[PDB]
Curated annotation (Swiss-Prot):
This is Large ribosomal subunit protein uL4. The structure indicates that the N-terminal domain may bind to the 23S rRNA, while the C-terminal domain may bind to the mRNA, which could then be implicated in transcriptional and translational control of the S10 operon. However, it is not known if the S10 operon is controlled in this fashion in this organism. It comes from the Bacteria. The gene is rplD. GO terms for cellular component: ribonucleoprotein complex; ribosome.
């Protein structure tokens, strides 16, 4: 599948190739709603993991197929400032839209975007990187925080290129 890669000025900077397995499957609505319920209220464990990933892929596919997915080359702010994020959202023609922004790493530039979204109702920013401590030696690639409920609650989904890569590494 393909999606335009945009910058914070709202200009197209490339054409990103993304996995059809992750972003363009026929959404399994039953599995998707089942996981929304779970977040709100051996072979089995493996099957359950697969169902959970299918729920996420179904939701991402809904966003892609409904033309509600935007991917930016990157989205960082040198300093937190609500107006800065508001201006970027205006450039992306999302000023009046409910938007979920999902960032890849717990680093200053992304934390600043999350802080800048605090005072914008209708915008939720998730940093899908929750390692707590620096886990001994190895750190798995995880997209903890990305959830079906928010993807369906918010009209548009904004990801960065590296966030797409993380999603593909986990769900692909």
């Amino acid at each position: 599948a393909q999606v335009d890669l945009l910058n914070v000025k709202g200009e197209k900077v490339g054409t990103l190739e993304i996995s059809d397995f992750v972003f363009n499957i026929d959404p399994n609505y039953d599995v998707m709603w089942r996981y929304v319920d779970m977040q709100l209220s051996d072979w089995s464990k493996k099957l359950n993991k697969k169902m959970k990933k299918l729920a996420l892929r179904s939701a991402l596919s809904v966003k892609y197929r409904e033309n509600k997915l935007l991917v930016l080359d990157d989205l960082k702010l040198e300093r937190p400032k609500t107006k800065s994020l508001k201006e970027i959202l205006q450039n992306l023609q999302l000023s009046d839209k409910k938007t979920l922004i999902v960032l890849p790493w717990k680093e200053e530039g992304y934390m600043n975007v999350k802080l800048s979204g605090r005072n914008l109702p209708d915008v939720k920013v998730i940093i899908a990187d929750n390692p707590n401590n620096s886990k001994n030696g190895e750190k798995a690639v995880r997209i903890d925080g990305l959830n079906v409920f928010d993807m369906l609650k918010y009209d548009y989904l904004v990801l960065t290129r590296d966030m797409v890569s993380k999603i593909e590494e986990v769900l692909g």
